[PDB]
């Protein structure tokens, strides 16, 4: 709402300036305003949206992890650590709720190219996964199944529509395997997904694209890093 008076092109421009200035909360607000104009986002613009919110929630996750570790050490004696961890947690959930709301209200569509559909469903899986990192009760079951369903729909599309070196397909599989290992407690599924993804990218390495091959080969290396850590 705060962004409603600004032209879409100016919001994009300002998101790029905020990225340059390392003002990621501003850049997420600008991109939210751009999304709310109701037009599709290009691949460049999806990157801006992704970078902004990942930076914001990344700092919140890092803070939450620090506070949670302090909280668990102090349980192994006031309310302050728990109260402040709950504070940061509530802010993190709000950002994830904002992103998931934009995905549901504006971005996830039946139409569009494969890149966009896979990317947004991957994003939905990621931000449910971030909610799952801090969930506990009846909410936690609902969230974990929501993440898996979004990842699975993204995988079905990526395998049918995308070459096995496509960086969005690779990044999705990487993130789905992290979900399996860290969230779903399924190390076998995580390992087999990451190995299958790596091997299938290597078998069809000729499908690397001139405009994205550096991204593809980075994710391939991260798949191998996880496989080394998990084995």
């Amino acid at each position: 709402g705060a962004m409603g008076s600004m032209e879409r092109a100016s919001l994009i421009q300002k998101a790029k300036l905020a990225e340059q200035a390392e003002r990621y909360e501003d850049m997420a607000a600008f991109m939210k305003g751009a999304v709310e104009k109701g037009e599709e986002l290009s691949c460049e613009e999806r990157n801006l949206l992704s970078v902004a919110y990942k930076n914001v929630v990344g700092g919140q996750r890092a803070a939450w992890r620090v506070l949670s570790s302090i909280e668990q050490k102090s349980n192994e004696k006031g309310p302050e650590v728990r109260e402040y961890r709950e504070k940061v947690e509530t802010e993190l959930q709000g950002v994830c709720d904002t992103v998931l709301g934009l995905l549901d209200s504006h971005l996830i569509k039946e139409a569009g190219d494969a890149e966009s559909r896979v990317f947004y469903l991957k994003m939905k899986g990621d931000y449910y996964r971030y909610l799952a990192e801090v969930a506990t009760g009846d909410d936690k079951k609902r969230i974990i199944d929501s993440a898996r369903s979004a990842y699975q729909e993204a995988m079905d599309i990526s395998k049918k529509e995308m070459p096995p070196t496509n960086p969005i397909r690779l990044g999705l599989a990487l993130n789905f395997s992290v979900f399996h290992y860290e969230i779903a407690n399924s190390p076998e599924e995580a390992i087999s997904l990451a190995k299958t993804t790596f091997d299938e990218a290597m078998a069809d390495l000729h499908t690397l694209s001139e405009d994205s091959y550096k991204d593809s080969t980075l994710i391939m290396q991260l798949l191998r890093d996880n496989l080394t850590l998990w084995t």
């Binding site: 992704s50 970078v51 990487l174 993130n175 992290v178 290992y181 860290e182 991260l222 996880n226 850590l229």
Partner: peptide, 10 residues
């Protein structure tokens, strides 16, 4: 050590 997910780029 945590698993590594997709990073930010560009």
């Amino acid at each position: 050590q945590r698993s590594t997910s997709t990073p930010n780029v560009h």
